[PDB]
């Protein structure tokens, strides 16, 4: 047998490639795992819930950090109707010159993506005005995820 998966000896003794595949699809079905009691079940669901909360927080932190670093938030404040919100920069070494020029948009110098999340409008309505407010939101969510 193998070590993987630790939670299912039936899959662990499978000598085929199925041993990998089924394990990936049975990793989060904790109730079917070996040795699982109800107490360990609820505690593992608790810890997974916190890990998911931290992933959510890191995701918002990523959006905020990339808008503050590579975005055009302040220029978008000064003209919210005719400036395009920038999600993040583009680094694709397989780009030609025409794709570099084409994705050089929204008043930027380098290729960027145009944000379509609406995060700019939501942050503008709730009082955020500078890149410093976005940066402080990013670091605060970066420690909130650590707390989770």
């Amino acid at each position: 047998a193998t070590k993987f998966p630790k939670f299912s000896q039936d899959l662990a003794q499978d000598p085929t490639t199925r041993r990998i595949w089924y394990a990936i699809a049975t990793a989060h079905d904790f109730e079917s795992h070996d040795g699982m009691t109800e107490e360990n079940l609820y505690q593992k669901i608790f810890a997974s819930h916190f890990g998911h909360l931290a992933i959510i927080f890191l995701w918002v932190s990523g959006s905020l950090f990339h808008v503050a670093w590579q975005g055009n938030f302040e220029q978008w404040i000064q003209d919210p109707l005719n400036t395009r919100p920038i999600a993040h920069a583009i680094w694709d070494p397989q780009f030609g010159k025409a794709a570099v020029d084409a994705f050089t948009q929204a008043g930027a110098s380098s290729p960027v993506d145009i944000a379509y999340s609406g995060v700019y409008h939501w942050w503008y309505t709730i009082g955020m005005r500078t890149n410093g407010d976005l940066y402080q939101g990013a670091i605060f969510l970066l420690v909130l995820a650590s707390l989770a």
Binding site: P93, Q94, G96, K97
Partner: protein, 152 residues
């Protein structure tokens, strides 16, 4: 419970500490090429040499006497190449003096043949690592244009 006797033995001159005995540190150290089980000594040597020779030329490339010239990479390479030559002479001298006694049937790096295989592997891997670091440093304009896509 965090700090306990090393391998459960109270009189061994060691403490089982989470730096010294935790699971992460143990698997990381034991899977370094000098300790990775199953390897031939020459492959251990090759990996160790690659890792060392790659970074050896860097201090002279950025800080050596040739750093403010057209030939900084070349000076760093010559320095790293001869330093690896001394390192390999040190390794082979250690193997010559350290295993003239009897041979252990267990670990191969504790025998003269295995240490000479490690020495040969170290020399080949370290000269390769030094030259590949020199080659990337010299052709850094090409690598830079490749990563920016300037050649597209």
């Amino acid at each position: 419970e965090l700090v306990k006797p090393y391998n459960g033995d109270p009189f061994a001159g060691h403490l089982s500490t989470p730096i010294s005995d935790s699971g992460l540190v143990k698997t990381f150290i034991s899977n370094l090429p000098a300790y990775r089980q199953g390897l031939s000594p020459i492959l251990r040597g090759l990996e160790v040499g690659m890792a060392h020779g790659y970074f050896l030329i860097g201090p002279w490339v950025k800080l050596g006497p040739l750093r403010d010239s057209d030939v900084a990479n070349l000076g760093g390479l010559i320095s790293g190449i001869t330093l690896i030559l001394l390192a390999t002479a040190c390794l082979a001298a250690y193997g010559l003096v350290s295993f003239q006694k009897a041979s252990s049937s267990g670990d191969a790096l504790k025998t003269g043949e295995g240490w000479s295989q490690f020495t040969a592997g170290f020399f080949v891997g370290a000269m390769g690592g030094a030259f590949v670091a020199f080659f990337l440093l010299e052709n850094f304009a090409v690598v830079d244009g490749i990563m920016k896509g300037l050649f597209n």
